[PDB]
Here is the input.
Amino acid sequence: KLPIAMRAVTNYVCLKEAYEEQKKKAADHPNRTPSIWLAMYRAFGRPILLSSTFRYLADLLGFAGPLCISGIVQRVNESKEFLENAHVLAVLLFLALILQRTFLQASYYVTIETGINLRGALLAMIYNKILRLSTSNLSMGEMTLGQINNLVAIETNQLMWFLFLCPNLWAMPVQIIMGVILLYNLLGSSALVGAAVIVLLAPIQYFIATKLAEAQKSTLDYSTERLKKTNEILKGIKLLKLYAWEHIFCKSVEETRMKELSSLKTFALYTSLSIFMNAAIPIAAVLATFVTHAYASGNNLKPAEAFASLSLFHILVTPLFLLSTVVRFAVKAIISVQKLNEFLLSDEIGDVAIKVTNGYFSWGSGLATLSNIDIRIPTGQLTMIVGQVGCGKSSLLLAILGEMQTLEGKVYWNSRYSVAYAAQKPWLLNATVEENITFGSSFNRQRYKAVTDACSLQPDIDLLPFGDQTEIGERGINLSGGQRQRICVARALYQNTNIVFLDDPFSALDIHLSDHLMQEGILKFLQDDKRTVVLVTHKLQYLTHADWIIAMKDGSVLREGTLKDIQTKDVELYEHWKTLMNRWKTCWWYLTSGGFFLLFLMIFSKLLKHSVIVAIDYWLATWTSEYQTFYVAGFSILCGAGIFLCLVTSLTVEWMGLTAAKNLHHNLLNKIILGPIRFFDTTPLGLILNRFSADTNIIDQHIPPTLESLTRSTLLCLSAIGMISYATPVFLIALAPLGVAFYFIQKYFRVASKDLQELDDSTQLPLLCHFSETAEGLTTIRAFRHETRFKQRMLELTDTNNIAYLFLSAANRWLEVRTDYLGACIVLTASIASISGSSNSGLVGLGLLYALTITNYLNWVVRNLADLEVQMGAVKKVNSFLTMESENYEGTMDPSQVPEHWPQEGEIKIHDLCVRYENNLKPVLKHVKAYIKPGQKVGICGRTGSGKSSLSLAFFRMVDIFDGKIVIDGIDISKLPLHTLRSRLSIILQDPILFSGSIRFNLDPECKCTDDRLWEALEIAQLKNMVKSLPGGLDATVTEGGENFSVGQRQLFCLARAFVRKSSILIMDEATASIDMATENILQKVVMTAFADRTVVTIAHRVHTILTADLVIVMKRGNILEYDTPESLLAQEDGVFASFVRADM
Ligand SMILES: CC(C)CCC[C@@H](C)[C@H]1CC[C@H]2[C@@H]3CC=C4C[C@@H](OC(=O)CCC(=O)O)CC[C@]4(C)[C@H]3CC[C@]12C
Ligand SMILES: Nc1ncnc2c1ncn2[C@@H]1O[C@H](COP(=O)(O)OP(=O)(O)OP(=O)(O)O)[C@@H](O)[C@H]1O
Ligand SMILES: Nc1ncnc2c1ncn2[C@@H]1O[C@H](COP(=O)(O)OP(=O)(O)O)[C@@H](O)[C@H]1O
Ligand SMILES: [Mg+2]
Ligand SMILES: [Mg+2]
Here is the structure.
């Protein structure tokens, strides 16, 4: 598959051992900063040393040029008989050239091999780091999943590209100094002035690199922030669109984008300055050297000395072409390795089945979240943990798993055994349903079918495209919340471990599915296997089945024992429980984004600059043909104009790139957020966030440099061809054969590169997805103790990706070799033609010296052209989203028709409403009719899939209405603008979507609310005390996803977010699914006493809540069966609502 030397495992072992030695060295000194750079040096130096050796040989074979040009010019002008003959010299020059290119390609080969090995090793290192880092890093804002993915995607690759270019950073100094010494030999002391001019590049480039590094660090910071915001928007589109907050968040993202673009503009300015200095300092050096020689050495330059000197100046200039690129990549790689080294130095993890004694545990802050934890989990018996929101239940489970640092106490596990964890927030991989349920276990049809039947997944999976073999999770078909949770519980049940930790598996399930699970999946299956079970549920009706009961309050265990033991000891708690139970074209578009003034300005300026440079060389040739005021003046003005045009041409391309990036991202963002919700439901979030992150990174930072280098190289090559044709006209005859060869080699390689690039992309997306899915749900992987299998999967995937990239690099080597040999042929033919058929001795020198140049710059033209193609692909994709369908915000109803207080009364009339999500799909609602009075408390109930949530989203026109009316306060919502409808009605969704920032930001992003009303809403939502206790009060931070809070607390925050708006109609959709009964009862009482005037429709998770309601609706497959008061439905014999009440109680 891949040679043992290039397997990721061996390179990883080497790098890890070197890094561990560096860690020991750091431990010794107070510096205490293990350095990745030295570890990489020790591990992978010898390859780079070999590459440097090859490059140093190539440099001498390059200096071979000036000598032969001198000899040929001298002989055309006027033992060892073969040595001087011009044709013999030309043959020798061709041979030396091919050998130099061979050595150069050898160095490039060694460096690419080492870079790929090091990328594999580093990905392995940071992956093992992911498998070791503590979740308290992601929970407290120390880092994010986005940063962990950014490392893998951008920063490792940037370091790899830098390693590709690494040898230059010391080979170029050597070559420049050697050229200066030889120039001294030729030109006397006059060459030392030019030597000083050239030397001044080192201070200049160091300063420019300092500024570039500052700018790049700022750009990376702002890009991370911008992508954080964009990812949150893409994930929470549903809530943002329902609340009409889309544009506020879009504006915030645009502000961060403006800051990032300012940083990018500073970086572009200094990159343009570096290019300008690199190009100009040689022109100034030539001017100074030759003026000084004219005025110092009375003897004029004979043609031989002159053309040798000009050739040496070309040899000096050739390395300077790359210097800007290498400084760019070195600065970016320095920042990347700083990030990687920060990541790799972070926080890491430190009968009775499980007993905890005097356990104090904390979530990393250093303050105990649990205290005096004295518990025991009896072996082979069901334990049930019961408590109100935020009482340390999930915390207790994770503490037993050892996921949070222990301040005191011990845990005994009569090393940890594999425990089956079904986390409260279900986590699914990107494999099929069968792969999620089996989760690395031998398939057994009997057990698989039993578990699937227990979790009632069979009806759901046969409705999927390819039942039991459909790609689930991100990058595949999405599943409803209940489906995902039941799949996760099925995964937990199917494994053959002995301890099963189920953290609230009934949150999304309805009464029927929940009861079926509780009976068949747990009480029967797990007891038949005699497995220990620990349940964390608010379903107090199941306490009769429990064998051991743990009661938690305010982080500490209040009481523990059997039900009878609790009744005997703590009568209060048992009585409380009983009371609670009631017992291409894209390239042209990118270029045109400038507006036809910057594009044409750029092209014209670059043409003129290259013309002036070649004119400088021609003037030197003619001047030394003299063998004077006029010549010095002409030379000086030529050089000055060259410098000026260098400056202009340096600025133009970078400005074009800045503008293109800004416009592309702005269009993408604005069009994406306006799209219909169906688009986000259908398209995986990956296919959008990738556009926003990776393609945007390309368009911002990779296209402008590639384009500018491409233009420089191509214009140098064309200019050399023109100068040669002027020197020897017959060369135009030989131009056609070589051009044909060029076309054919490029044809073949371009198709090959397309194919291998497709392979590389297809092999890397699974690797990034693996890093993602392991970063998330880390606790699950470490609970099943499947870390070894995941390490193996990572190793094999990275080996596959490395094989793909190795083939791509081999194709690059093929084309580089072919084109370099074509250039060598060009040099040989041009030298012969100039020797035999040129008019003046000066012309042959110019022709030969530009023949030398074509070889180097043709390779760059080819390589940069291919890179520009692959990079324009992303512009093609980002622009593609500009084709999307956009939701109709216009609205037919006139603004004057809409009152100032539209939902003043709150009455709604639903007339023959029928709704479906996409055309040619099943109508989920069927001729539903409703009449809710103003100031009416309605309760809607039913089984999952009855269309309650469809009816809820109908009010906000998030579901397409085939036929019907929804008349709210006398206006058909279809006529109104979308935002006036979606802003004057409030809805509480079941799944809490909480953004990063303060409590204020989540409660009121617009900051249009006084703190008093925020406190009021928090008090209604039963969170006033917790927020008061928090360090910052209403300014306290919320991490991404609200992970620093409990799930129930997240839902309560989502309730406060709706209570603040204070509209007249409130659609609460199963909002108390994750909230416990104790909190839920008081919350409902307070909401009824507070919103008594408004109309509230509550899609209820438990019918006990809507037992007290003015009106009750029961849905069944989109049909309203019964429409009356709860008393009437209860008194109906064999009614549906009565059965619901019996089951729930
Ligand atoms: C002029 C001739 C003789 C050689 C042309 C290249 C060289 C001048 C070498 C010597 C000094 C080197 C530079 C000096 C140090 C840096 C800064 C370095 O980035 C940092 O030091 C981090 C930023 C910071 O210091 O805060 C990136 C490479 C770079 C530009 C080096 C690139 C290669 C340079 C320019
Ligand atoms: N990931 C976390 N990082 C840091 N602190 C946390 C984290 N999760 C919860 N906390 C803190 O732990 C305390 C206890 O919450 P815990 O996570 O144990 O909730 P829970 O009782 O299992 O939740 P619920 O019953 O509402 O589902 C909360 O006050 C919260 O501040
Ligand atoms: N995002 C969606 N796209 C298309 N169809 C959906 C979507 N969500 C649910 N449905 C379909 O609508 C029907 C009712 O779903 P839903 O409204 O979620 O019921 P509930 O009232 O239990 O939430 C189901 O049969 C399901 O197939
Ligand atoms: Mg919990
Ligand atoms: Mg629903």
